[PDB]
Design a protein around this nucleic acid. Structure first.
Ligand SMILES: [Mg+2]
Ligand SMILES: [Mg+2]
Ligand SMILES: [Mg+2]
Ligand SMILES: [Mg+2]
Ligand SMILES: [Mg+2]
Ligand SMILES: [Mg+2]
Ligand SMILES: [Mg+2]
Ligand SMILES: [Mg+2]
Ligand SMILES: [Mg+2]
Ligand SMILES: [Mg+2]
Lengths: 273, 53, 86, 93, 63, 131
RNA sequence: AAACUUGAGUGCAGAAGAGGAAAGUGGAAUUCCAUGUGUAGCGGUGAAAUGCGCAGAGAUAUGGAGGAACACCAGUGGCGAAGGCGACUUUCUGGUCUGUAACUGACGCUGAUGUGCGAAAGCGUGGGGAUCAAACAGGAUUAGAUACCCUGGUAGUCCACGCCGUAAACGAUGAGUGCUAAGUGUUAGGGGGCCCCUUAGUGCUGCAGCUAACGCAUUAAGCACUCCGCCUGGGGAGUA
RNA sequence: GGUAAAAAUGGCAA
């Protein structure tokens, strides 16, 4: 799955890439495409609010069915396709009635596999059921937090969570972070693990390839001026020179917890990551 | 589980208890697994003890 | 391989009826068995113990094929094209 | 190949549901090129040890003949998912 | 002693046959050594797989 | 596998002679029969019998033990071997134990003793020494 | 060149097995976490202390999480070329032994160079982490204690896929074949009347013979033939 | 089951 480039140039030295063997169709479905103009970390005011976003390759948005709310109709996987907007691959599925939707491609999903959603669906990869119907110990992905909203958790390449137990209206789940939390039993989840597992292993290789992905350079605070950053200034190279390392906006940035208190989810969370 | 018999001494029951423990061999097992013995050593002890038996 | 399949192979390559020991019969069965273990090894690549059996079977086939070429070259040439071994 | 399957059903199951359960699972064992030679209910028996906090279980034994292990695979998969089937074992012979 | 299985001409041990198996296990549920029982080598092996299969299905106790 | 049938024969004789067995049986061959016949002729062995078996035949040799159970054959040694063949000219024919022993020689005039070879002026492969 | 069946294979009928690979399923125990009961220690040692506990420990009861290993069976028992292989189930797969004598008809043996497998530690990438535990940190002991002992503890120990290629990797005993007193136990068979005979393993005892001696002795280190590897005083040196 | 703990060193010749 990982291809290692030969060192023909210093740029290509130690660079690796995905083979894309899993991809079956190279072109997206026209009906499910929407425009996605780049924001480059700029908000409604027109001001930068998130650093290091800019440029990158032009991309089209593929509409994905995170909800998986079409029940009682079997769907056949037509193809696995590349999606530039996410780490995982996506699968075009054709329902019996002729409706075509994109879903997150699970690991081990194949062309011609049948996928179904509903309470009566079987526990097989690519099937979407309410957490109630899913047995303990099943690895799942695309988990909803609010019923009918659509999956928000365990969507990244190789993402998964395990059902641990049932507690009345809520089901206990262990997340990839390692956090164990309660999720409403009515919320749906899809069976299996997200595919494209080798994504993390990719060695980008050169600065330019980061630029293609719309990542702008990160300047360290220590090589800035004092007016720019609390790490700024000092004659020659300087150590942090402060009790804590600090963010560019003057907040301690190593070990300091930023989770807000008095949140509704606090009761739902059983064990932190 | 040894149960004290009617018109039987606790000391008499204790005799019965001790014998049942011996047959169970729970004491024997506990001593063996006090400290780790490397696989080869374990096999040797099994053989020579059987040679004694 | 199944005794049924083996028996089918003997009938296809038996020099005479009642022949079970001719190089042709022995080679043919060996060829089937080598392929079956090669199939096993494709799924099970770390079954080193089974691969050793396969190596012995390949050598036994080679030695019989050596003997047959020595004795009858036509019989050899016919067998190798039939079994697709070379 | 003849396979003998033994499964225990939870003691708290309703009788009508239990009948539906056995029908499903004994049906599975005849799904693919497989024939159920015999199916027998041993009935409720005390378990030697507690399984899933149950001290008793309804024991069912089925004997099945097939040229594949697809039916026995489907049984074991579905027996794992089921909360009714507390224990199961497939034996070739 | 004497091998029960040889004497009684029994060649297959069923894990489902609890009553037979209970005779060859101790009060603690431990499998009895073949010296004490007098079982043959071939049948000690057969019986013992049967006991382990029976214990799996909770027909016999582990302890 | 078996590499020297002659050497096997001589070892079987040596082994049986050590334990003072009356008789020994071995698989037969034309050379082994000829060797046996010379041993009887030279008085080393009592008798040789051949039994047809539908394979290669069987040779039965009866050993000789003198009064006081003294062994008539003291020793046997293979000279020419599969690893290294040994030949001699009639002039170079060896004497075993200064004529007290014999050498069995394969010559174009047949398998014979060293004395006959010198007499007939024909050399050959030295099969073994028996003394 | 032509025959033959004894070697070597094949068929046929049987036999046993922790042989191997991949899934799945158990039960015991350890650790941790959560509560209930409860109380001033627990733990540890030659003796101590460090540590843990009084912010309720340890203990006891119940529940949950997770990893690793499979009590009893179990045996100079079994299987494998060796390294090795021990819960159970299923799937795939290798080898071996017995009998028979369908068949083939010497098709065999050894094996330089090759080419694979190869305990443990170790290395790389990713995952996992209960237990144990190099390093490391306290305590102790001691003249000192960079140790032994105690309390902890990271890598590692586990999984996958690559690499490494070494061990007192040992029976310190290369492989093949035949021959040469007996007695006794055991594993898997075969045959004939519990006994006898027989095949292949695995032990003990013991002639002949061998050996410097110790010992070996049909499982040779005896008697032979074939082929391969290896040795030629110690150190320097398995170094340059 | 044990177990007490500690317990160093001593020119080459004849
Ligand atoms: Mg950034
Ligand atoms: Mg500057
Ligand atoms: Mg400032
Ligand atoms: Mg500064
Ligand atoms: Mg400076
Ligand atoms: Mg290792
Ligand atoms: Mg320690
Ligand atoms: Mg070495
Ligand atoms: Mg023997
Ligand atoms: Mg001195």
């Amino acid at each position: 799955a990982i291809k290692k480039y030969k060192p023909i140039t210093n740029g290509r030295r130690n660079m690796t890439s995905l083979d894309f063997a899993e991809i079956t169709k190279t072109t997206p479905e026209k009906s499910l495409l929407k425009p996605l103009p780049k924001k480059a970390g700029r908000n409604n005011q027109g001001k930068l609010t998130v650093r290091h976003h800019g440029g990158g390759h032009k991309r089209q948005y593929r509409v994905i069915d995170f909800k998986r709310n079409k029940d009682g109709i079997n769907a056949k996987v037509d193809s696995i396709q590349y999606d530039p907007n996410r780490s995982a691959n996506i699968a075009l599925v054709v329902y019996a009635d002729g409706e075509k939707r994109y879903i997150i491609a699970p690991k081990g999903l194949e062309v011609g596999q049948i996928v179904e959603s509903g309470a009566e669906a079987d526990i097989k990869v690519g099937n979407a059921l309410p957490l109630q119907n899913i047995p303990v110990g099943t690895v799942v992905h695309n988990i909803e937090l609010k019923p009918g909203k659509g999956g928000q958790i365990a969507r990244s390449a190789g993402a998964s969570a395990q059902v641990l137990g049932k507690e009345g209206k809520y089901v206990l789940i262990r997340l990839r972070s390692g956090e164990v939390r309660m999720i409403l039993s009515t919320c749906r989840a899809t069976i299996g693990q997200v595919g494209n597992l080798q994504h993390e292993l990719v060695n980008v290789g050169k600065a330019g390839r980061s630029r293609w992905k719309g990542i702008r350079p990160t300047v360290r605070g220590s090589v800035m001026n004092p007016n720019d950053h609390p790490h700024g200034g000092g004659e020659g190279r300087a150590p942090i020179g402060r009790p804590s390392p600090m963010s560019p906006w003057g907040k301690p940035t190593l070990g300091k917890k930023t989770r807000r208190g008095k949140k509704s989810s606090d009761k739902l969370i059983v064990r932190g990551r | 589980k040894t149960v004290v018999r009617k018109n039987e001494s606790l000391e008499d029951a204790l005799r019965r208890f001790k014998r049942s423990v011996s047959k169970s061999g729970t004491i024997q097992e506990v001593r063996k697994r006090e400290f780790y013995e490397k696989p080869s050593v374990k096999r040797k002890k099994k053989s020579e003890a059987a040679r004694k038996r | 391989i199944s005794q049924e399949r083996k028996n089918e192979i003997i009938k296809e390559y038996r020099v005479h009826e009642t022949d079970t020991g001719s190089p042709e019969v022995q080679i043919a069965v060996l060829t089937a068995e080598i392929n079956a273990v090669n199939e096993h090894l494709r799924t099970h690549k770390k079954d080193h113990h089974s691969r050793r059996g396969l190596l012995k079977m390949v050598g036994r086939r080679r030695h019989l094929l050596n003997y047959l070429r020595s004795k009858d070259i036509q019989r050899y040439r016919e067998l190798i094209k039939s079994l697709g071994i070379r | 190949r003849t396979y003998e399957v033994m499964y225990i059903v939870r003691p708290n199951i309703e009788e009508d549901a239990k009948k539906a359960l056995v029908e499903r699972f004994n049906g599975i064992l005849a799904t693919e090129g497989a024939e159920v030679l015999e199916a027998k209910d041993w009935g409720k028996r005390r378990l030697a040890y507690e399984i899933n906090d149950f001290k008793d279980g309804f024991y069912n034994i089925v004997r099945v003949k097939s040229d594949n292990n697809k039916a026995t695979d489907e049984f074991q998969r579905l027996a794992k998912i089921s909360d009714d089937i507390i224990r199961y074992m497939v034996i070739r012979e | 002693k004497v091998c029960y299985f040889t004497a009684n001409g029994i060649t297959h041990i069923d894990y489902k046959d609890t009553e037979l198996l209970k005779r060859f296990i101790s009060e603690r549920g431990k499998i009895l050594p073949r010296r004490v029982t007098g079982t043959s080598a071939k049948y000690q092996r057969m019986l013992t797989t049967a006991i382990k299969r029976s214990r799996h299905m909770a027909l016999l106790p582990y302890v | 596998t078996m590499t020297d049938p002659i050497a096997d024969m001589l070892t079987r004789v040596r082994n049986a002679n050590m334990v003072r067995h009356e008789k020994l049986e071995l698989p037969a061959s034309n050379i082994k029969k000829e060797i046996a016949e010379i041993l009887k002729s030279e008085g080393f062995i009592k008798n040789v019998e051949y039994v047809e078996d539908d394979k290669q035949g069987v040779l039965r040799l009866f050993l000789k033990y003198g009064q006081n159970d003294e062994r008539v054959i003291t020793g046997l040694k293979r000279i020419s071997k599969p690893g290294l063949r040994v030949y001699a000219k009639a002039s170079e024919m060896p004497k075993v134990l200064n004529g007290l022993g014999i050498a069995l020689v394969s010559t174009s005039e047949g398998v014979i003793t060293d004395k006959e070879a010198r007499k007939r002026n024909v050399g050959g492969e030295i099969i073994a020494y028996v003394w």
